[PDB]
Scaffold this active site. Structure first.
Site, short mmCIF file in Angstrom:
data_model
loop_
_atom_site.label_atom_id
_atom_site.label_comp_id
_atom_site.label_asym_id
_atom_site.label_seq_id
_atom_site.Cartn_x
_atom_site.Cartn_y
_atom_site.Cartn_z
CE1 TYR F 26 1.16 0.25 4.33
CE2 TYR F 26 -0.12 2.26 4.12
CZ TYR F 26 0.80 1.49 4.80
OH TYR F 26 1.37 1.95 5.96
CG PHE F 36 1.23 10.21 4.96
CD1 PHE F 36 0.08 10.33 4.21
CD2 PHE F 36 1.23 9.34 6.04
CE1 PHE F 36 -1.04 9.58 4.49
CE2 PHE F 36 0.12 8.58 6.33
CZ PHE F 36 -1.01 8.70 5.56
CG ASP F 37 3.39 4.75 4.84
OD1 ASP F 37 4.60 4.54 4.64
OD2 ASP F 37 2.65 3.95 5.44
CB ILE F 56 -6.66 2.78 11.88
CG1 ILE F 56 -6.73 2.90 10.36
CG2 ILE F 56 -5.35 3.34 12.37
CD1 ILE F 56 -6.89 4.32 9.88
CE1 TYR F 82 -2.26 7.26 13.70
CE2 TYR F 82 -3.29 6.80 11.59
CZ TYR F 82 -2.28 6.59 12.50
OH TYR F 82 -1.28 5.69 12.21
CG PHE F 99 -4.33 4.17 2.76
CD1 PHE F 99 -3.51 5.25 3.00
CD2 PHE F 99 -4.70 3.38 3.83
CE1 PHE F 99 -3.11 5.57 4.27
CE2 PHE F 99 -4.30 3.68 5.11
CZ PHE F 99 -3.49 4.78 5.33
#
Ligand SMILES: [Ca+2]
Ligand SMILES: [Ca+2]
Lengths: 139, 97, 650, 64, 68, 107
Positions: F26, F36-37, F56, F82, F99
């Site tokens: 992912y 960011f990821d 999560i 979050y 995502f």
């Protein structure tokens, strides 16, 4: 002491002029500061370790490592060899800076402490009259 | 130039930066004048490198001010190393800030 | 990013951000290190490493960022334990070849060197679960790039280009070597690459080149670690030799030294007592005569072999760099000669290693790992709610199985100085009591450990708060040698705190400390006894009148004076002709009892028929030592009668 | 004379029969601890006059 | 065999199974030796290998079996 | 419940069944596409058991809906994410994450 070990004179010329141009009252201040206590054979500490080893390394009594002091007065002797009559005057009065420290007075007060340190060490010892190494080595 | 004079009087002694507890948030409150801040900034940078005591004084409400100081002025690297000096003391660094 | 080479405002501002990223993640903010990699994403840094057109300010920031994100947490961790050199006694440690017939690329390296623990920088709900050590990346890919970087940069930089990546040669070489420096420390570059990378440097040229100022400073740190690995190999050389030597020497002497003992008769005239002695003294007696049996051929061969190449050229290359290239940078010349002194004095470095090391067995290597981790935890925690990890660390130390077995090791680690530094660092406070409770446990484990704590009492008493004063009295409890080694002028500071109790209660602790200062054995000393009571003329502090006033009237004052009598009860002269047939020891018998006309039936009777066993039993020792058979009968049944009556009153 | 002569063996049996007998850990340690004060203090140390005379080989001299 | 228990009882007077340094110092001053506290703590801890501080009876009996 | 745009379909019927650890790949960016990821960036497949509650809950609810070989776009509600604190240092208060999830294997 290793530089002055032959009673050198050119280096003796060097320290005096360096003390003249960049006049350092802190040096003689740090001398008598070093010279202040610096060692005492003090028999109170002698008594206890005899009782300590009598009922239980060692050798750290002797004037609190006086081997440093034998080097210091060697450095003072080797700083005035060859009779540097300017420099022997300079250790007395030190007319360079605004304030002055007479080390020649202070070195009388070192052995006066040492003479008082050694005389009563006999006066403790004056009746036992048989010598071990711990009397002999500390003498 | 007044801040320039006061910026001189901190860089010498560890006493003077330690003599600046209460002036800190006083300076950070004056920091929002926002016309002469660079003179205040060199002051507050120089105290932060010479006192580890003053690091424990400054708290979050001063920090969010300094973050918004980057907003009002944009991109000033003099602000940026202030945060880097806020990170590390003479030897140590605080985990909280 | 490559456009920024003339956008000098945006160049410099992004540079100081790159300072700030390297700033906040310093000395192991491992949660913040996981926070930063979302903004940096280290495969970006791989592209930041390779690009030979990045400006030099951006290059030195990015290489520095790659270290303190991923490496400096472990790098400083193994930097701390580079002065321990402990080892297990296992068979692979026993079977090291120990010698050349020399390479610094040692294959085995069987020391401790604590663990490699990383964590994934994910973004799932394991927030305070991974949280602890480091982010990670394929560092095995990275070490392929570094050799690809360095071997290319040497053969290209050899012609002294006007390009090299940061313009200057400084931005070229310095961040690579510094990256290579920290990567060498972290247990990477096995000897296939060491022999490869020394072909870049030694061949036995990179150091033979002409170099700028701070690059050789990096190389100076690089050369020292090779000398450091030379040192640990020699200690690993000497330990396997100590295996079969002791295995010979335990069987050879001690059984055959017992052989003449069985064939003698049982008397101990000369020959038994010469090696039947103290254990370290027996080893000192056994090894002391080998430098003036059938085994001393093994020693004199090996001292010639552990006489000791790199030692040639390192001793050359400092003399080069001082000669043609007169130096600024007092950091550099300080760094230079300490190698040069260590090269011509290799034994003196080996001097300062042997009272730092030890050899354990394979069962105990489990309990050391977390212990070295927690000791590594504290030394990392030294730079700073901050102490929540410390107490869990300290309690982990207290609950170590192999901690009691080797009390010399904590003395060898010097960890007491580390914990005592925290005490200085704290006190300019709940972690105070967690610290001292370790220390009072720490002195009590053995004898010479208590000697090690003795050297700090001049500082230690100065911070009496309520405990710190528990430590000083615990360091003198039994060893009469340490009782005699204590001197007078600190006790002036002790009784100065007693004069402050002219307002009290908190003098209860100083008197218990002085109770450990004069008695210590079951029989008191007299040298500490006379000096304190001569001070207690100079300071004063109805006594038996107000003693009953506390019986009705916060129960501290009757306990407070109960120690003051117990102090005097310990500092009796003696209970013998040591007391009787002597001089001026009876003079203190007068000056003690002069201040106390007797009156003690307040203490004898009035409590003992009901706070009871504390004051009156302390009053027993005062009458016993300081103070006729009518009084052997007068005070009777005062105390024994309630002991007879209330015996079954449970 | 019989009961006190056997006691003088039990006088010494503490100090004599345990002699580095059990622990191989302390034995190899105190060997090294004994090795420090015995074999290390040597005399490979006349390099120094060669060392300083290797410094005065010239600017500013490396000794300077 | 029980004479070894007799020699063990010559030290033990309080009766708890351990020989403290006071008893060994007492019999040593009764014999004629004048040991220091270093030598007395050595010989009273020359039995001590586990670290309880004093002398127990199994180590004493295997010491008697080890000397003669 | 939580929004899903299927990027490309896989087999459809073999959804990630409960009691299996999802070997996935992912990436992830903000509402504005600020990246960011990426699990691809670290060259590492992420793995997690359904019902273990280690991811999560919005990502797990989106993961249960997909199928084997199917890659999809997870546009998650920030309050299922979050939330009001965000990730304290990474994710701002209440921002929609995007995502690109892709399954490979199960357990
Ligand atoms: Ca006993
Ligand atoms: Ca026992």
């Amino acid at each position: 002491i290793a530089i002055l070990n032959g009673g050198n004179s050119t280096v003796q010329q060097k320290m005096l002029e360096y003390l003249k141009e960049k006049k350092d009252v802190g040096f003689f201040q740090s001398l008598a500061g070093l010279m202040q206590s610096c060692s005492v054979l003090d028999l109170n500490a002698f008594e206890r370790q005899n009782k300590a080893e009598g009922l239980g390394g060692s050798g750290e009594k002797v004037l609190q490592d006086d081997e440093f002091t034998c080097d210091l007065f060697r450095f003072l002797q080797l700083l005035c060899e060859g009779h540097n009559s300017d420099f022997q005057n300079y250790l007395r009065t030190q007319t360079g800076n605004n304030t002055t420290v007479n080390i020649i007075i202070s070195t009388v007060d070192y052995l006066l402490r040492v003479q008082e340190s050694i005389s009563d060490f006999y006066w403790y010892y004056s009746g036992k009259d048989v010598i071990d190494e711990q009397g002999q080595r500390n003498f | 130039s007044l801040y320039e004079l006061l910026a001189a009087l901190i860089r010498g002694n560890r006493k003077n930066c330690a003599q600046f507890s209460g002036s800190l948030d006083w300076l950070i409150s004056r920091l929002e004048r926002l016309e002469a801040s660079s003179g205040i900034l060199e002051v507050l940078h120089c105290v932060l490198v010479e006192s580890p005591e003053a690091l424990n004084i400054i708290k979050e409400g001063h920090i969010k001010s300094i973050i918004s100081l980057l907003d009002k002025h944009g991109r000033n690297h003099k602000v940026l190393d202030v945060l880097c000096s806020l990170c590390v003391c003479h030897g140590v660094a605080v985990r909280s800030n | 990013i490559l456009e920024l080479t003339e956008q000098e405002e945006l160049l410099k501002f992004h540079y100081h951000t790159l300072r700030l990223y390297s700033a906040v993640c310093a000395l192991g903010n491992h949660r913040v290190a996981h926070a930063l990699c979302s903004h940096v994403d280290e495969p970006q840094l791989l592209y930041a490493i390779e690009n030979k057109y990045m400006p030099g300010l951006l290059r030195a920031g990015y290489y520095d960022l790659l270290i303190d994100i991923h490496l400096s947490s472990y790098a400083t961790a193994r930097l701390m334990m580079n002065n321990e050199f402990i080892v297990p006694m296992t068979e692979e440690t026993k079977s090291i070849t120990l010698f050349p017939d020399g390479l610094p690329g040692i294959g085995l390296s069987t020391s401790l060197r604590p663990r490699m623990q990383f964590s994934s920088p994910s973004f799932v709900s394991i927030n305070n679960e991974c949280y602890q050590y480091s982010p990670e990346f394929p560092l095995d890919i990275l070490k392929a790039k570094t050799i690809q970087m360095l071997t290319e940069a040497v053969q290209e930089g050899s012609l002294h280009a006007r390009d090299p990546v940061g313009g200057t040669t400084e931005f070229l070489f310095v961040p690579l070597i510094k990256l290579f420096y920290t990567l060498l420390i972290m247990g990477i570059f096995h000897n296939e690459d060491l022999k490869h990378i020394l072909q870049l440097i030694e061949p036995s040229g990179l150091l033979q080149m002409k170099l700028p100022e701070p690059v050789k400073l990096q190389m100076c740190l690089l050369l020292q670690y090779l000398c450091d690995c030379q040192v640990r190999h020699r200690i690993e050389a000497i330990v396997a030799f100590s295996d079969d030597f002791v295995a010979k020497l335990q069987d050879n002497q001690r059984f055959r030294y017992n052989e003449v003992m069985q064939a003698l008769n049982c008397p101990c005239p000369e020959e038994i007592r010469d090696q039947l002695l103290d254990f370290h003294e027996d080893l000192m007696t056994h090894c002391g005569i080998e430098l003036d049996l059938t085994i001393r051929g093994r020693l004199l061969s090996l001292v010639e072999k552990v006489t000791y190449t790199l030692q040639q050229l390192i001793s050359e290359t400092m003399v080069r760099w001082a000669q043609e290239s007169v130096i600024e940078d007092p950091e550099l010349v300080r760094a230079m000669f300490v190698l040069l002194h260590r090269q011509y004095d290799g034994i003196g470095g080996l001097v300062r290693a042997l009272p730092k090391t030890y050899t354990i067995n394979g069962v105990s290597v489990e309990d050391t790992i977390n212990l070295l981790a927690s000791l590594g935890q504290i030394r990392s925690l030294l730079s700073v709610e901050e102490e929540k990890l410390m107490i869990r660390g300290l309690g982990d130390i207290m609950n170590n199985k192999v901690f009691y077995q080797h009390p010399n090791l904590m003395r060898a680690l010097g960890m007491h100085e580390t914990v005592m530094e925290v005490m200085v660092n704290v006190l300019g406070p709940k972690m105070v009591a967690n610290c001292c409770r370790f220390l009072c446990y720490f002195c009590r484990i053995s004898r010479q450990n208590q000697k090690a704590m003795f050297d700090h009492l001049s500082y230690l008493l100065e911070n009496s708060s309520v405990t710190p004063l528990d430590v000083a009295a615990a360091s003198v409890m039994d060893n009469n040698e340490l009782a005699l080694a204590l001197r007078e002028p600190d006790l002036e500071k002790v009784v100065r705190y007693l004069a402050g109790c002219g307002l009290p209660v908190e003098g209860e602790r100083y008197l218990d400390f002085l109770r450990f200062a004069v008695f210590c054995n079951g029989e008191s000393v007299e040298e500490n006894a006379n000096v304190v009571v001569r001070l207690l003329i100079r300071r004063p502090e109805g006594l038996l009148a107000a003693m009953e006033e506390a019986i009705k009237i916060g129960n501290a004052i009757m306990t407070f004076y109960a120690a003051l009598i117990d102090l005097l009860g310990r500092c009796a002269p003696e209970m013998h002709l040591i007391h009787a047939a002597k001089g001026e020891a009876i003079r203190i018998r007068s000056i003690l009892r002069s201040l106390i006309p007797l009156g003690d039936l307040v203490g004898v009777i009035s409590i003992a028929f009901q706070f009871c066993p504390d004051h009156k039993a302390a009053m027993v020792l005062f009458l016993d030592r300081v103070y006729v058979q009518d009084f052997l009968l007068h005070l009777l049944e005062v105390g024994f009668l309630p002991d007879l009556r209330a015996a079954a009153s449970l | 004379l019989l009961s006190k002569q056997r006691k003088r063996a039990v006088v010494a049996c503490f100090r004599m029969a345990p002699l580095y007998n059990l622990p191989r850990h302390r034995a190899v340690n105190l060997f090294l601890q004994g090795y420090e004060k015995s074999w290390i203090e040597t005399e490979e140390h006349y390099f120094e006059d060669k060392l300083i005379e290797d410094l005065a080989k010239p600017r500013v001299d490396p000794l300077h | 065999i029980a004479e070894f228990k007799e020699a063990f009882s010559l030290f033990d007077k309080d009766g708890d199974g351990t020989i403290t340094t006071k008893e060994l110092g007492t019999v040593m001053r009764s014999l004629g030796q004048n040991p220091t506290e270093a030598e007395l703590q050595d010989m009273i801890n020359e039995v001590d290998a586990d670290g309880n501080g004093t002398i127990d009876f199994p180590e004493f009996l295997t010491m008697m079996a080890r000397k003669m | 419940g939580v929004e899903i745009e299927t990027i490309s379909p896989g087999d459809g019927r073999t959804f990630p069944k409960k009691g299996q650890t999802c070997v996935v790949h992912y990436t992830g960016m903000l509402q504005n596409g600020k990246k960011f990821d990426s699990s691809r960036d670290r060259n590492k497949p992420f793995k997690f058991r359904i019902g273990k509650q280690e991811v999560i809950k919005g990502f797990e609810e989106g993961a249960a809906q997909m199928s084997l070989g199917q890659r999809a776009k997870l546009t998650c509600t920030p309050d299922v994410a979050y939330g009001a604190t965000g990730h304290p240092g990474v994710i701002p208060p209440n921002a929609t994450l995007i995502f690109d999830v892709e399954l490979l294997n199960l357990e």
